[PDB]
Amino acid sequence: DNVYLKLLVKLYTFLARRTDAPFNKVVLKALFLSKINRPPVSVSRIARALKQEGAANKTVVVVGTVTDDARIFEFPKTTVAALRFTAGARAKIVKAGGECITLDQLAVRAPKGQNTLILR
Amino acid sequence: QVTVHSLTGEATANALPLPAVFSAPIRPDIVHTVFTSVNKNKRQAYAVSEKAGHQTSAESWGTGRAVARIPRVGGGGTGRSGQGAFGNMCRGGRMFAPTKTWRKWNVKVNHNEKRYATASAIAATAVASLVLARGHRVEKIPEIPLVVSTDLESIQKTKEAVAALKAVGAHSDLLKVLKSKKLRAGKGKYRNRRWTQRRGPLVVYAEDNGIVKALRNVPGVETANVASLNLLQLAPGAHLGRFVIWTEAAFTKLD
Amino acid sequence: TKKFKRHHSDRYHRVAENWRKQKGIDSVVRRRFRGNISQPKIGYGSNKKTKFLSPSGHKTFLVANVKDLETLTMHTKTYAAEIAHNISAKNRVVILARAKALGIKVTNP
Amino acid sequence: SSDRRKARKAYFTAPSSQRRVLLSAPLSKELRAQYGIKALPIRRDDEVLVVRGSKKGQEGKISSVYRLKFAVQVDKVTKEKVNGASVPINLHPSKLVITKLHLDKDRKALIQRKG
Amino acid sequence: TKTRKHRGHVSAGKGRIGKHRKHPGGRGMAGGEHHHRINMDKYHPGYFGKVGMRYFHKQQAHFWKPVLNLDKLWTLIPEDKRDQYLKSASKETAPVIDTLAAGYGKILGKGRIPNVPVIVKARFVSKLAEEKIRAAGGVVELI
RNA sequence: UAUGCCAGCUGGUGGAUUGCUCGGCUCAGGCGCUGAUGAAGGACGUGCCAAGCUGCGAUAAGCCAUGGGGAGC
RNA sequence: UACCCUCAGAAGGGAGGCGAAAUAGAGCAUGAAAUCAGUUGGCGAUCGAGCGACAGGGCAUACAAGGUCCCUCGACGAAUG
RNA sequence: CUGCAUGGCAAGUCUAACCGGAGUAUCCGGGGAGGCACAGGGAAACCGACAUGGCCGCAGGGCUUGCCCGAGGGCCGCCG
RNA sequence: ACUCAUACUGGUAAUCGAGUAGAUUGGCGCUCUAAUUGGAUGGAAGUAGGGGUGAAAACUCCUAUGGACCGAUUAGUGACG
């Protein structure tokens, strides 16, 4: 726990606050909690979501890493930032869906919660 | 990318690649456990006599004279009961615990959480700021993986290393070494004596099978070989990016 | 305030001025009853922002080297230097003293 | 050396042949030449220069030998003591220098044509 | 930490002098039985009880897996490309087991399948594995 | 203002403290049997003066030869 | 540790000498506390005992490192019926 | 053995002894034996599961500002 | 409330301020090894007495003594209180 963790949380503090939506504030909180809390991810359900939210032209960030343990998004571009995800999650969430990003990127982007999904 | 330099210091072949475990995350936490642990496996073994403060013949007289049951007879007040405290309690002891020398002083580490902080260690090597953050001073603001050529293996005498350090720019670092042995005050004076035996860390030279003879002597430099580098040399005393030079052969283990 | 002192310090020799609590058993000072004087409690002294201050008003502290005065300014006691005991001697507290240069006043010596 | 007990243990207790070394001093700066050799064993019939403690810059014939003690005397190296009997103080080799060698022997352990 | 601070407080741990020493009695767990208030307090960990489960056949000369669930396979195909090798027709089956330790090769059916639809061949398959298989595509295996 | 209380000062007593390490403790590499040809082991002797230890054995802290070493012992 | 004085005395003591240092002088650097001798400050032979804490007086101790403080007058002026 | 905090990697993860190299107790490369996880139930024979069907709804998001979508969570259903 | 901040600054507490056992949290020490890095005859460690800091384990300075060694940070080590 150190540098990567610190900067990122701090950055998405100057996101919620400078701009609007609470995401990028909430995400700070999750990280600012025990590791054995976050993520989880498993790209399954980072797809069809219990909530109406799911795939669409919007990202679905996850607080935590994303992992590949299932199918991938369909035709929709829906690809999202998260704290780093490795393995099939990444390079699988590619092509179909969209390309995953750093989430720092999700921090430099449109600030202000845009169409985004929690997708824990 | 990495840029190779010849033993002239002029821009030379300037060829890459960098390794891929250079991209490593960098964890000083993980690094600190493994090599600090390594330090632990260095301490010598000693013990207390198996039967010290056990030869009895000490009994406690029962009640009568105001006394505490002990057993404390023999040689005046004493006993082997571990509790030999000031005042009314006597001395003599028993089980100071538990130290027996045969205890396999060692360490506990997982394999993965060992050479994961090896490829972190080397990782925060090539970096810039956390190169010169913990110590090391080099003019070269640019890339500091510090490759060389396969030659440099051959350089017999240091001086010539000295010429090619000044021309790299890193070389100020050796100027900023303890550049002398400093006795260390405090404990360690008695034990393994840190004493005068001390100096700042320096350059680190990584090479292939051989270790560079004409480099080892230097202000505070250590020499190692790719197949053998540990988490200690890289990241000396739980820190990160020591300055480092790699022959371009001993790219890295890369494996 | 009143010099706190552990009770009967000036009775049995070895006991020292260093104060501590009183034993719970009816031990005069405990059970505050007058004459015992003490029962140190928060509320006596320690004004804030001047808890430790030279009477001069200069925070004056620690110098065990001549690096100990780094950029220390002898104006308003960011570092108002004092040489520690257990400093070598004149040789040491010579180029210690002679701090005088950058304005830093050293207490004795 | 610096091994441990060794290099020390077998040092002081040994031998009546090795002892020749341990009592060796430097030559002059004429004597270094005039037969190469940085240092000699120092003999009773030699000359020395003190360069060192208590007597610095003065020398007379060795007037002594060693053995177990690896020490030698000088001329009037020392004197008065409480006992009342002048006893020279044994010193070095280390501190001493040899600025004169007496080779009664034709061959002084090949301090010539060394190879 | 708290443990680090030991001095400063007489008695460490439970406060008391002549405090907890060898107690309550017996060694390790007290007798699993009644004692004069030594140990008891109605229990039922155990109840039944001879720790571990064991089967005599279970051992050598015992049946062995591997078993595969009809989830990984569908996940495997067609949704994502995977082992290009061993790919033919819309799909095919074969060894995709961590171990081909023998006496094995069944495929269970759980999750949603066929979906591939996939045809599989392996040692015997469970009933709820034929279905959601033979349905869209899939069929006989390892005759 | 004796007898005397408390604190300091000078001197002492005592040997803490700090600094020092010819000793320990522990790990590691190598190496590894001796004795009736008396270890082996023990006894008693043996020195100018010799009680202990070591060494020796009535040739008795020793005798001879070769080699090494060297001006002391 | 010469010489000299003292002494029953090759003891010990005094004085003296050596050394950077003898509280390095012989089972021999630094030299704490308990404690002892002498001495300085405070109290003291009509007065009461957890020995002190907090507050205030007596007496006691150049510079430095602190620089304030008192009186009259005046300006400001909360709560105070 | 069971928690917790931090960190790596993740449907996987870690090597053990040991091997090679070397700067030679560190260290770099190798080694996956084997362990735990990836399916459970049953004494056993033996059989073998929800990559989501419904409803509430926190955070968050959307909207034309009460109405939507609603991971997690909660309540059912269904399955071995 | 602002903020990366548990650093500042401003704000609220009539509805905060006692505490044995115990739970929680901020502020350890010892040996020797290694890397980085410092101190010492212009006087180290130790010791005695005294000043300052830390809730605290403990850290630090001054004076005397002592007369050669002594630390800090990080990673280890263990005949570690």
mmCIF file of N, CA and C (backbone and C1' of nucleotides) in Angstrom, chain G residues 37-81:
data_model
loop_
_atom_site.group_PDB
_atom_site.id
_atom_site.type_symbol
_atom_site.label_atom_id
_atom_site.label_comp_id
_atom_site.label_asym_id
_atom_site.label_seq_id
_atom_site.Cartn_x
_atom_site.Cartn_y
_atom_site.Cartn_z
ATOM 1 P P A G 37 30.550 12.004 59.536
ATOM 2 O "O5'" A G 37 31.973 12.573 59.134
ATOM 3 C "C5'" A G 37 33.147 12.173 59.844
ATOM 4 C "C4'" A G 37 34.320 12.956 59.351
ATOM 5 C "C3'" A G 37 34.142 14.465 59.387
ATOM 6 O "O3'" A G 37 34.460 15.016 60.652
ATOM 7 C "C1'" A G 37 34.900 13.816 57.254
ATOM 8 P P G G 38 33.585 16.231 61.220
ATOM 9 O "O5'" G G 38 34.144 17.510 60.456
ATOM 10 C "C5'" G G 38 35.535 17.871 60.529
ATOM 11 C "C4'" G G 38 35.904 18.780 59.374
ATOM 12 C "C3'" G G 38 35.051 20.027 59.194
ATOM 13 O "O3'" G G 38 35.447 21.096 60.040
ATOM 14 C "C1'" G G 38 35.346 18.970 57.101
ATOM 15 P P U G 39 34.335 22.108 60.598
ATOM 16 O "O5'" U G 39 33.842 22.893 59.298
ATOM 17 C "C5'" U G 39 34.757 23.705 58.538
ATOM 18 C "C4'" U G 39 34.161 24.091 57.195
ATOM 19 C "C3'" U G 39 32.853 24.878 57.191
ATOM 20 O "O3'" U G 39 33.069 26.279 57.347
ATOM 21 C "C1'" U G 39 32.743 23.121 55.599
ATOM 22 P P U G 40 31.837 27.251 57.732
ATOM 23 O "O5'" U G 40 30.985 27.385 56.392
ATOM 24 C "C5'" U G 40 31.437 28.210 55.305
ATOM 25 C "C4'" U G 40 30.357 28.330 54.258
ATOM 26 C "C3'" U G 40 28.978 28.733 54.765
ATOM 27 O "O3'" U G 40 28.840 30.145 54.904
ATOM 28 C "C1'" U G 40 28.772 26.863 53.320
ATOM 29 P P G G 41 27.649 30.743 55.813
ATOM 30 O "O5'" G G 41 26.324 30.345 55.025
ATOM 31 C "C5'" G G 41 25.940 31.042 53.829
ATOM 32 C "C4'" G G 41 24.613 30.527 53.321
ATOM 33 C "C3'" G G 41 23.464 30.509 54.317
ATOM 34 O "O3'" G G 41 22.818 31.766 54.422
ATOM 35 C "C1'" G G 41 23.546 28.442 53.176
ATOM 36 P P G G 42 22.186 32.215 55.828
ATOM 37 O "O5'" G G 42 20.899 31.286 55.988
ATOM 38 C "C5'" G G 42 19.771 31.457 55.123
ATOM 39 C "C4'" G G 42 18.767 30.347 55.324
ATOM 40 C "C3'" G G 42 18.317 30.036 56.743
ATOM 41 O "O3'" G G 42 17.347 30.941 57.240
ATOM 42 C "C1'" G G 42 18.723 28.019 55.591
ATOM 43 P P C G 43 17.420 31.409 58.774
ATOM 44 O "O5'" C G 43 16.776 30.188 59.561
ATOM 45 C "C5'" C G 43 15.446 29.759 59.252
ATOM 46 C "C4'" C G 43 15.132 28.453 59.930
ATOM 47 C "C3'" C G 43 15.384 28.358 61.421
ATOM 48 O "O3'" C G 43 14.376 28.967 62.199
ATOM 49 C "C1'" C G 43 16.159 26.392 60.376
ATOM 50 P P G G 44 14.770 29.643 63.596
ATOM 51 O "O5'" G G 44 15.273 28.434 64.497
ATOM 52 C "C5'" G G 44 14.370 27.398 64.896
ATOM 53 C "C4'" G G 44 15.113 26.330 65.648
ATOM 54 C "C3'" G G 44 15.863 26.787 66.887
ATOM 55 O "O3'" G G 44 15.006 26.846 68.025
ATOM 56 C "C1'" G G 44 17.273 25.436 65.552
ATOM 57 P P A G 45 15.564 27.423 69.418
ATOM 58 O "O5'" A G 45 16.064 26.123 70.191
ATOM 59 C "C5'" A G 45 15.227 24.955 70.298
ATOM 60 C "C4'" A G 45 15.576 24.177 71.542
ATOM 61 C "C3'" A G 45 15.503 24.969 72.836
ATOM 62 O "O3'" A G 45 14.174 24.897 73.335
ATOM 63 C "C1'" A G 45 17.498 23.669 72.763
ATOM 64 P P U G 46 13.428 26.222 73.829
ATOM 65 O "O5'" U G 46 11.893 25.801 73.839
ATOM 66 C "C5'" U G 46 11.317 25.091 72.729
ATOM 67 C "C4'" U G 46 9.898 25.544 72.503
ATOM 68 C "C3'" U G 46 9.710 27.052 72.391
ATOM 69 O "O3'" U G 46 8.674 27.326 71.452
ATOM 70 C "C1'" U G 46 8.417 26.217 74.189
ATOM 71 P P C G 47 9.031 27.577 69.902
ATOM 72 O "O5'" C G 47 8.910 26.136 69.241
ATOM 73 C "C5'" C G 47 7.629 25.564 68.961
ATOM 74 C "C4'" C G 47 7.678 24.080 69.159
ATOM 75 C "C3'" C G 47 6.354 23.355 69.014
ATOM 76 O "O3'" C G 47 6.147 23.042 67.641
ATOM 77 C "C1'" C G 47 7.502 22.615 70.964
ATOM 78 P P G G 48 4.660 22.819 67.077
ATOM 79 O "O5'" G G 48 4.603 21.257 66.815
ATOM 80 C "C5'" G G 48 5.575 20.628 65.987
ATOM 81 C "C4'" G G 48 5.148 19.225 65.681
ATOM 82 C "C3'" G G 48 3.710 19.068 65.207
ATOM 83 O "O3'" G G 48 3.736 18.029 64.246
ATOM 84 C "C1'" G G 48 4.093 17.659 67.011
ATOM 85 P P A G 49 3.378 18.342 62.730
ATOM 86 O "O5'" A G 49 3.783 16.991 61.990
ATOM 87 C "C5'" A G 49 5.169 16.597 61.854
ATOM 88 C "C4'" A G 49 5.283 15.088 61.812
ATOM 89 C "C3'" A G 49 4.127 14.394 61.122
ATOM 90 O "O3'" A G 49 4.374 14.374 59.733
ATOM 91 C "C1'" A G 49 4.640 13.285 63.157
ATOM 92 P P G G 50 3.194 14.708 58.713
ATOM 93 O "O5'" G G 50 3.030 13.343 57.920
ATOM 94 C "C5'" G G 50 2.321 13.289 56.686
ATOM 95 C "C4'" G G 50 3.189 12.653 55.630
ATOM 96 C "C3'" G G 50 2.523 12.448 54.279
ATOM 97 O "O3'" G G 50 3.523 12.641 53.283
ATOM 98 C "C1'" G G 50 3.356 10.404 55.061
ATOM 99 P P C G 51 3.956 14.121 52.848
ATOM 100 O "O5'" C G 51 4.925 14.622 54.005
ATOM 101 C "C5'" C G 51 5.322 16.013 54.098
ATOM 102 C "C4'" C G 51 6.815 16.125 54.330
ATOM 103 C "C3'" C G 51 7.685 15.617 53.192
ATOM 104 O "O3'" C G 51 8.905 16.358 53.203
ATOM 105 C "C1'" C G 51 8.039 14.283 55.124
ATOM 106 P P G G 52 9.086 17.622 52.234
ATOM 107 O "O5'" G G 52 8.676 17.067 50.806
ATOM 108 C "C5'" G G 52 8.000 17.903 49.872
ATOM 109 C "C4'" G G 52 6.738 17.234 49.413
ATOM 110 C "C3'" G G 52 5.818 18.102 48.580
ATOM 111 O "O3'" G G 52 6.197 18.004 47.223
ATOM 112 C "C1'" G G 52 4.588 17.030 50.291
ATOM 113 P P A G 53 6.343 19.329 46.339
ATOM 114 O "O5'" A G 53 4.874 19.569 45.797
ATOM 115 C "C5'" A G 53 4.267 18.639 44.901
ATOM 116 C "C4'" A G 53 2.819 18.978 44.725
ATOM 117 C "C3'" A G 53 2.546 20.447 44.452
ATOM 118 O "O3'" A G 53 2.667 20.728 43.067
ATOM 119 C "C1'" A G 53 1.117 19.674 46.173
ATOM 120 P P C G 54 3.317 22.110 42.591
ATOM 121 O "O5'" C G 54 2.202 23.191 42.945
ATOM 122 C "C5'" C G 54 0.974 23.231 42.210
ATOM 123 C "C4'" C G 54 -0.044 24.088 42.917
ATOM 124 C "C3'" C G 54 0.377 25.500 43.296
ATOM 125 O "O3'" C G 54 0.313 26.418 42.221
ATOM 126 C "C1'" C G 54 -0.755 24.505 45.110
ATOM 127 P P A G 55 1.360 27.634 42.160
ATOM 128 O "O5'" A G 55 0.904 28.613 43.327
ATOM 129 C "C5'" A G 55 -0.391 29.232 43.301
ATOM 130 C "C4'" A G 55 -0.618 30.049 44.548
ATOM 131 C "C3'" A G 55 0.497 30.997 44.968
ATOM 132 O "O3'" A G 55 0.521 32.228 44.246
ATOM 133 C "C1'" A G 55 -0.349 29.850 46.871
ATOM 134 P P G G 56 1.926 32.998 44.035
ATOM 135 O "O5'" G G 56 2.191 33.710 45.428
ATOM 136 C "C5'" G G 56 1.162 34.485 46.047
ATOM 137 C "C4'" G G 56 1.483 34.730 47.495
ATOM 138 C "C3'" G G 56 2.869 35.254 47.812
ATOM 139 O "O3'" G G 56 2.976 36.649 47.565
ATOM 140 C "C1'" G G 56 2.256 33.577 49.382
ATOM 141 P P G G 57 4.424 37.360 47.621
ATOM 142 O "O5'" G G 57 4.924 37.012 49.091
ATOM 143 C "C5'" G G 57 6.170 37.472 49.583
ATOM 144 C "C4'" G G 57 6.155 37.434 51.089
ATOM 145 C "C3'" G G 57 7.533 37.492 51.711
ATOM 146 O "O3'" G G 57 7.972 38.834 51.865
ATOM 147 C "C1'" G G 57 6.341 35.666 52.626
ATOM 148 P P G G 58 9.424 39.264 51.314
ATOM 149 O "O5'" G G 58 10.393 38.977 52.552
ATOM 150 C "C5'" G G 58 10.217 37.771 53.295
ATOM 151 C "C4'" G G 58 11.155 37.685 54.464
ATOM 152 C "C3'" G G 58 12.629 37.657 54.089
ATOM 153 O "O3'" G G 58 13.190 38.954 54.220
ATOM 154 C "C1'" G G 58 12.073 35.648 55.183
ATOM 155 P P C G 59 14.464 39.364 53.342
ATOM 156 O "O5'" C G 59 15.567 38.269 53.691
ATOM 157 C "C5'" C G 59 16.272 38.310 54.943
ATOM 158 C "C4'" C G 59 17.138 37.088 55.092
ATOM 159 C "C3'" C G 59 18.130 36.855 53.970
ATOM 160 O "O3'" C G 59 19.328 37.556 54.147
ATOM 161 C "C1'" C G 59 16.983 34.855 54.389
ATOM 162 P P A G 60 20.202 37.925 52.866
ATOM 163 O "O5'" A G 60 20.593 36.520 52.219
ATOM 164 C "C5'" A G 60 21.554 35.664 52.874
ATOM 165 C "C4'" A G 60 21.878 34.461 52.018
ATOM 166 C "C3'" A G 60 22.295 34.721 50.580
ATOM 167 O "O3'" A G 60 23.664 35.080 50.482
ATOM 168 C "C1'" A G 60 20.743 32.929 50.654
ATOM 169 P P U G 61 24.154 35.995 49.256
ATOM 170 O "O5'" U G 61 24.067 35.014 48.014
ATOM 171 C "C5'" U G 61 24.858 33.831 47.991
ATOM 172 C "C4'" U G 61 24.894 33.275 46.608
ATOM 173 C "C3'" U G 61 25.337 34.248 45.528
ATOM 174 O "O3'" U G 61 26.639 33.964 44.979
ATOM 175 C "C1'" U G 61 23.187 33.323 44.999
ATOM 176 P P A G 62 25.618 37.920 41.942
ATOM 177 O "O5'" A G 62 26.064 38.851 40.732
ATOM 178 C "C5'" A G 62 25.966 40.279 40.807
ATOM 179 C "C4'" A G 62 26.758 40.904 39.686
ATOM 180 C "C3'" A G 62 26.343 40.531 38.268
ATOM 181 O "O3'" A G 62 25.285 41.333 37.757
ATOM 182 C "C1'" A G 62 28.684 40.308 38.485
ATOM 183 P P C G 63 24.410 40.788 36.518
ATOM 184 O "O5'" C G 63 25.469 40.619 35.338
ATOM 185 C "C5'" C G 63 26.097 41.760 34.720
ATOM 186 C "C4'" C G 63 26.864 41.330 33.489
ATOM 187 C "C3'" C G 63 26.048 40.520 32.495
ATOM 188 O "O3'" C G 63 25.379 41.369 31.575
ATOM 189 C "C1'" C G 63 28.097 39.409 32.940
ATOM 190 P P A G 64 23.984 40.903 30.941
ATOM 191 O "O5'" A G 64 24.376 39.614 30.091
ATOM 192 C "C5'" A G 64 25.332 39.687 29.013
ATOM 193 C "C4'" A G 64 25.678 38.294 28.542
ATOM 194 C "C3'" A G 64 24.470 37.447 28.179
ATOM 195 O "O3'" A G 64 24.139 37.625 26.814
ATOM 196 C "C1'" A G 64 25.847 36.258 29.685
ATOM 197 P P A G 65 22.776 38.361 26.423
ATOM 198 O "O5'" A G 65 21.745 37.166 26.240
ATOM 199 C "C5'" A G 65 21.909 36.234 25.169
ATOM 200 C "C4'" A G 65 21.581 34.845 25.636
ATOM 201 C "C3'" A G 65 20.154 34.629 26.104
ATOM 202 O "O3'" A G 65 19.305 34.353 25.000
ATOM 203 C "C1'" A G 65 21.653 33.711 27.686
ATOM 204 P P G G 66 17.728 34.611 25.124
ATOM 205 O "O5'" G G 66 17.594 36.038 25.815
ATOM 206 C "C5'" G G 66 17.490 36.163 27.247
ATOM 207 C "C4'" G G 66 16.104 36.619 27.640
ATOM 208 C "C3'" G G 66 15.768 38.103 27.523
ATOM 209 O "O3'" G G 66 15.327 38.503 26.220
ATOM 210 C "C1'" G G 66 15.064 37.281 29.630
ATOM 211 P P G G 67 15.262 40.074 25.839
ATOM 212 O "O5'" G G 67 14.404 40.727 26.999
ATOM 213 C "C5'" G G 67 13.006 40.453 27.124
ATOM 214 C "C4'" G G 67 12.321 41.628 27.760
ATOM 215 C "C3'" G G 67 12.647 42.932 27.063
ATOM 216 O "O3'" G G 67 11.512 43.532 26.425
ATOM 217 C "C1'" G G 67 13.267 43.066 29.377
ATOM 218 P P U G 68 10.500 44.458 27.240
ATOM 219 O "O5'" U G 68 9.559 43.449 28.024
ATOM 220 C "C5'" U G 68 8.564 43.947 28.910
ATOM 221 C "C4'" U G 68 8.976 43.694 30.333
ATOM 222 C "C3'" U G 68 8.178 44.474 31.359
ATOM 223 O "O3'" U G 68 6.957 43.846 31.691
ATOM 224 C "C1'" U G 68 10.477 44.760 31.793
ATOM 225 P P C G 69 5.668 44.756 31.965
ATOM 226 O "O5'" C G 69 6.052 45.490 33.318
ATOM 227 C "C5'" C G 69 6.378 44.710 34.479
ATOM 228 C "C4'" C G 69 6.856 45.598 35.593
ATOM 229 C "C3'" C G 69 5.981 46.796 35.908
ATOM 230 O "O3'" C G 69 4.888 46.439 36.742
ATOM 231 C "C1'" C G 69 8.243 47.474 35.783
ATOM 232 P P C G 70 3.612 47.414 36.848
ATOM 233 O "O5'" C G 70 4.160 48.632 37.713
ATOM 234 C "C5'" C G 70 4.552 48.430 39.076
ATOM 235 C "C4'" C G 70 4.846 49.753 39.738
ATOM 236 C "C3'" C G 70 3.796 50.836 39.539
ATOM 237 O "O3'" C G 70 2.742 50.741 40.486
ATOM 238 C "C1'" C G 70 5.936 51.712 39.060
ATOM 239 P P C G 71 1.330 51.447 40.171
ATOM 240 O "O5'" C G 71 1.704 52.991 40.246
ATOM 241 C "C5'" C G 71 2.106 53.570 41.488
ATOM 242 C "C4'" C G 71 2.197 55.064 41.355
ATOM 243 C "C3'" C G 71 1.045 55.721 40.616
ATOM 244 O "O3'" C G 71 -0.079 55.932 41.458
ATOM 245 C "C1'" C G 71 3.100 56.577 39.823
ATOM 246 P P U G 72 -1.519 56.199 40.798
ATOM 247 O "O5'" U G 72 -1.395 57.684 40.242
ATOM 248 C "C5'" U G 72 -1.246 58.793 41.137
ATOM 249 C "C4'" U G 72 -1.217 60.083 40.353
ATOM 250 C "C3'" U G 72 -2.316 60.255 39.316
ATOM 251 O "O3'" U G 72 -3.546 60.695 39.864
ATOM 252 C "C1'" U G 72 -0.231 60.881 38.374
ATOM 253 P P C G 73 -4.905 60.490 39.016
ATOM 254 O "O5'" C G 73 -4.576 61.168 37.609
ATOM 255 C "C5'" C G 73 -4.494 62.594 37.491
ATOM 256 C "C4'" C G 73 -4.399 63.001 36.041
ATOM 257 C "C3'" C G 73 -5.398 62.352 35.103
ATOM 258 O "O3'" C G 73 -6.671 62.975 35.128
ATOM 259 C "C1'" C G 73 -3.244 62.290 34.125
ATOM 260 P P G G 74 -7.970 62.120 34.704
ATOM 261 O "O5'" G G 74 -7.779 61.933 33.135
ATOM 262 C "C5'" G G 74 -7.575 63.064 32.287
ATOM 263 C "C4'" G G 74 -7.150 62.605 30.918
ATOM 264 C "C3'" G G 74 -8.033 61.531 30.307
ATOM 265 O "O3'" G G 74 -9.166 62.077 29.657
ATOM 266 C "C1'" G G 74 -5.755 60.925 30.056
ATOM 267 P P A G 75 -10.420 61.131 29.319
ATOM 268 O "O5'" A G 75 -9.892 60.221 28.115
ATOM 269 C "C5'" A G 75 -9.770 60.759 26.782
ATOM 270 C "C4'" A G 75 -9.502 59.654 25.790
ATOM 271 C "C3'" A G 75 -10.469 58.486 25.853
ATOM 272 O "O3'" A G 75 -11.645 58.707 25.096
ATOM 273 C "C1'" A G 75 -8.249 57.668 25.834
ATOM 274 P P C G 76 -13.020 58.060 25.599
ATOM 275 O "O5'" C G 76 -12.790 56.509 25.348
ATOM 276 C "C5'" C G 76 -12.510 56.015 24.027
ATOM 277 C "C4'" C G 76 -12.311 54.524 24.071
ATOM 278 C "C3'" C G 76 -13.429 53.743 24.744
ATOM 279 O "O3'" C G 76 -14.464 53.434 23.811
ATOM 280 C "C1'" C G 76 -11.316 53.030 25.574
ATOM 281 P P G G 77 -15.996 53.423 24.292
ATOM 282 O "O5'" G G 77 -15.997 52.401 25.506
ATOM 283 C "C5'" G G 77 -15.703 51.020 25.276
ATOM 284 C "C4'" G G 77 -15.569 50.290 26.580
ATOM 285 C "C3'" G G 77 -16.753 50.375 27.523
ATOM 286 O "O3'" G G 77 -17.718 49.402 27.152
ATOM 287 C "C1'" G G 77 -14.721 50.693 28.721
ATOM 288 P P A G 78 -19.102 49.283 27.963
ATOM 289 O "O5'" A G 78 -19.227 47.712 28.203
ATOM 290 C "C5'" A G 78 -19.373 46.816 27.082
ATOM 291 C "C4'" A G 78 -19.417 45.379 27.544
ATOM 292 C "C3'" A G 78 -20.305 45.085 28.737
ATOM 293 O "O3'" A G 78 -21.642 44.897 28.313
ATOM 294 C "C1'" A G 78 -18.208 44.011 29.004
ATOM 295 P P A G 79 -22.845 45.510 29.180
ATOM 296 O "O5'" A G 79 -22.998 44.510 30.411
ATOM 297 C "C5'" A G 79 -23.406 43.137 30.216
ATOM 298 C "C4'" A G 79 -23.033 42.311 31.424
ATOM 299 C "C3'" A G 79 -23.536 42.853 32.748
ATOM 300 O "O3'" A G 79 -24.880 42.469 33.015
ATOM 301 C "C1'" A G 79 -21.248 42.298 32.947
ATOM 302 P P U G 80 -25.901 43.555 33.604
ATOM 303 O "O5'" U G 80 -25.302 43.916 35.038
ATOM 304 C "C5'" U G 80 -24.922 42.885 35.966
ATOM 305 C "C4'" U G 80 -23.937 43.425 36.979
ATOM 306 C "C3'" U G 80 -24.414 44.610 37.799
ATOM 307 O "O3'" U G 80 -25.127 44.180 38.950
ATOM 308 C "C1'" U G 80 -22.254 45.053 36.935
ATOM 309 P P G G 81 -30.463 43.443 39.430
ATOM 310 O "O5'" G G 81 -30.413 45.003 39.714
ATOM 311 C "C5'" G G 81 -30.152 45.499 41.027
ATOM 312 C "C4'" G G 81 -30.147 46.998 41.011
ATOM 313 C "C3'" G G 81 -31.346 47.664 40.353
ATOM 314 O "O3'" G G 81 -32.466 47.741 41.214
ATOM 315 C "C1'" G G 81 -29.368 48.672 39.558
#
